[PDB]
Amino acid sequence: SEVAHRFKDLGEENFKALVLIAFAQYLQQCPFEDHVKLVNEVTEFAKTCVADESAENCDKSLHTLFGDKLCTVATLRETYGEMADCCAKQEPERNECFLQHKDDNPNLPRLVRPEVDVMCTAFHDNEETFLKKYLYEIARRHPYFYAPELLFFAKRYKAAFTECCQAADKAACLLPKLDELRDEGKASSAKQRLKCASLQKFGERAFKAWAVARLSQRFPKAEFAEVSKLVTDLTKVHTECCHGDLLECADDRADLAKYICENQDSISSKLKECCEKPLLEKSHCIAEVENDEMPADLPSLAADFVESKDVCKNYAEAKDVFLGMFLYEYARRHPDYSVVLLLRLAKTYETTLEKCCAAADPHECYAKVFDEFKPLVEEPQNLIKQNCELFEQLGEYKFQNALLVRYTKKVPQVSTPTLVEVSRNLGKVGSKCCKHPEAKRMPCAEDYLSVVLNQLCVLHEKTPVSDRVTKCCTESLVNRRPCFSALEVDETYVPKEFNAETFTFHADICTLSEKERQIKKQTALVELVKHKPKATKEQLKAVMDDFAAFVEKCCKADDKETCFAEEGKKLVAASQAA
Ligand SMILES: CC[C@@](O)(C(=O)O)c1cc2n(c(=O)c1CO)Cc1cc3ccccc3nc1-2
Numbered sequence: 255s256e257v258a259h260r261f262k263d264l265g266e267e268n269f270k271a272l273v274l275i276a277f278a279q280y281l282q283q284c285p286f287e288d289h290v291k292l293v294n295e296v297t298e299f300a301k302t303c304v305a306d307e308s309a310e311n312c313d314k315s316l317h318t319l320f321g322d323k324l325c326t327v328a329t330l331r332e333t334y335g336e337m338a339d340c341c342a343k344q345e346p347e348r349n350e351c352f353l354q355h356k357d358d359n360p361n362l363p364r365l366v367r368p369e370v371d372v373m374c375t376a377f378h379d380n381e382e383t384f385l386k387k388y389l390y391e392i393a394r395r396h397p398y399f400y401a402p403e404l405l406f407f408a409k410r411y412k413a414a415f416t417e418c419c420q421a422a423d424k425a426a427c428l429l430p431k432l433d434e435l436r437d438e439g440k441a442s443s444a445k446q447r448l449k450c451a452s453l454q455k456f457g458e459r460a461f462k463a464w465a466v467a468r469l470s471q472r473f474p475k476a477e478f479a480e481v482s483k484l485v486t487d488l489t490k491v492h493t494e495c496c497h498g499d500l501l502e503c504a505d506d507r508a509d510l511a512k513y514i515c516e517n518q519d520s521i522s523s524k525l526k527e528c529c530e531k532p533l534l535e536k537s538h539c540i541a542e543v544e545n546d547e548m549p550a551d552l553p554s555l556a557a558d559f560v561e562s563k564d565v566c567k568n569y570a571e572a573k574d575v576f577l578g579m580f581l582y583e584y585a586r587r588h589p590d591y592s593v594v595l596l597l598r599l600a601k602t603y604e605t606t607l608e609k610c611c612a613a614a615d616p617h618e619c620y621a622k623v624f625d626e627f628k629p630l631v632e633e634p635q636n637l638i639k640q641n642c643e644l645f646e647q648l649g650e651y652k653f654q655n656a657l658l659v660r661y662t663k664k665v666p667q668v669s670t671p672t673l674v675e676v677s678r679n680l681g682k683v684g685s686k687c688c689k690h691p692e693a694k695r696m697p698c699a700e701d702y703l704s705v706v707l708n709q710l711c712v713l714h715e716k717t718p719v720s721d722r723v724t725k726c727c728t729e730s731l732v733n734r735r736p737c738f739s740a741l742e743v744d745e746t747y748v749p750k751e752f753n754a755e756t757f758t759f760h761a762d763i764c765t766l767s768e769k770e771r772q773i774k775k776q777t778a779l780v781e782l783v784k785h786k787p788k789a790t791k792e793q794l795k796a797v798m799d800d801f802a803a804f805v806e807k808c809c810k811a812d813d814k815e816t817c818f819a820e821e822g823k824k825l826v827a828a829s830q831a832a
Pocket residue numbers: 365366367368388392396407432433435436438439440443
């Protein structure tokens with residue numbers, strides 16, 4: 255009995271929370287109360303099986319039981335569409351159909367933040383409904399969120415209302431906490447979409463390679479075999495979560511945290527404080543721990559991987575473990591290299607051996623592999639450096655605007671709402687990284703860029719429209735950032751000017767939040783480039799100044815909002831001609 259085994263390992267509160275997540279991530283459109291109802295029926299039944307494993311349907315697989323239960327409300331096609339397809343199939347085809355239909359961008363309303371009082375009240379009314387509502391609204395909007403990590407967010411979200419709703423100043427206590435959750439959640443959501451993309455589109459080998467490089471940078475004192483044990487466990491964990499085996503995911507990860515804390519001494523010296531925290535916090539901690547110091551001396555790599563006379567023999571015995579050791583050994587020594595660079599390096603090294611081990615004295619042919627890594631290291635280095643300089647002398651917003659133009663030009667076919675979100679997010683790399691030293695700037699920057707570009711890829715695949723986007727997204731996971739950086743302006747692009755209402759601001763632009771106000775400013779910049787590309791650089795900055803003041807004043811006009819036409823039509827003319 256599986257549901258019995260998992261129910262007792264995870265305990266009831268989390269079991270219930272994880273089932274609700276699983277339903278909310280598969281049927282993102284079902285209303286909240288329907289999902290709660292289903293989760294409760296499933297929870298009644300689990301207990302039945304805990305009480306008797308030889309009962310009833312207690313011997314079924316989780317996806318059969320859970321899939322059957324979901325389909326009691328999904329099969330209604332007239333309201334869910336293409337999801338009744340999945341309900342016509344049996345496991346495991348049914349689960350695969352659910353995985354294919356996760357929506358990275360469902361047509362759901364913006365999450366709104368009520369007044370602090372309104373929220374504390376709704377919290378006090380029914381604390382448990384308030385929390386499940388949180389789990390539900392986040393999950394359906396982030397169908398790939400790392401499920402056990404979402405439990406931790408709920409925990410903190412609860413603690414924020416519990417504490418701040420009885421502070422003297424409720425707002426001053428509550429708001430900065432939520433803002434912090436909103437921001438960390440967004441980063442965590444994106445980071446985990448990359449994890450699942452790599453698993454699902456590029457396969458297990460890709461995720462393992464990522465894992466060896468990151469855990470080795472993180473745990474450079476650890477023996478190689480230790481890291482492999484860790485890589486293997488971690489790989490099963492994310493394979494389970496991305497495959498929608500959420501109960502197994504949580505359980506296996508909780509065991510993983512345990513194994514780590516009971517063997518810190520063979521892993522890292524940074525884990526002491528983390529391994530004292532409670533269950534959820536402990537696992538949040540370990541997964542993001544700062545890198546350990548690397549051993550003081552360390553050889554030279556060239557000896558075991560270039561000058562040895564057994565390198566072809568080690569490669570031929572087991573490519574995987576030998577290339578793994580290379581990645582292990584090169585990564586431990588380089589916390590200053592991005593994870594992607596480190597993987598380009600291992601691919602270059604792998605490719606070189608496959609060539610040189612042919613014949614004609616291989617030992618002579620592989621002699622300069624490390625001279626090939628040089629330009630691969632230089633390229634990202636100059637990009638980040640050259641970019642931080644540009645950022646520091648422009649400030650996030652103008653930096654964001656510049657990326658917005660350069661990228662609209664790279665791939666103008668791409669929908670505007672997508673260009674805006676990705677650009678703003680790409681631009682965020684300035685604040686996040688440029689503060690850093692050189693020996694910390696690359697992993698901070700490139701891996702973050704890789705996460706943002708994966709968002710581009712997945713928001714685009716749902717409905718493809720740019721060959722170039724599809725090519726970079728499909729061709730090689732590790733090379734995405736280079737493949738996008740190398741794109742120049744699309745010369746084939748045909749502009750679609752005129753206008754109509756896609757430049758006529760309305761009066762409700764005054765009641766929206768300031769960032770949300772830039773979003774319709776930056777939106778309109780995209781339609782400006784998309785239809786008048788090659789408009790240099792400086793009358794772009796002149797049409798942007800012109801949009802700002804026009805909104806500043808027509809919100810001050812106190813008029814019958816006919817100014818939103820007045821200086822609305824006085825820009826349309828200077829914009830085109832001169
Ligand atoms: C329910 C929380 C809250 O309503 C809040 O007041 O902070 C809220 C929460 C969130 N967002 C929001 O726009 C708002 C509204 O600003 C976006 C967003 C992305 C997230 C991604 C991952 C995890 C939690 C997230 N929470 C929020």
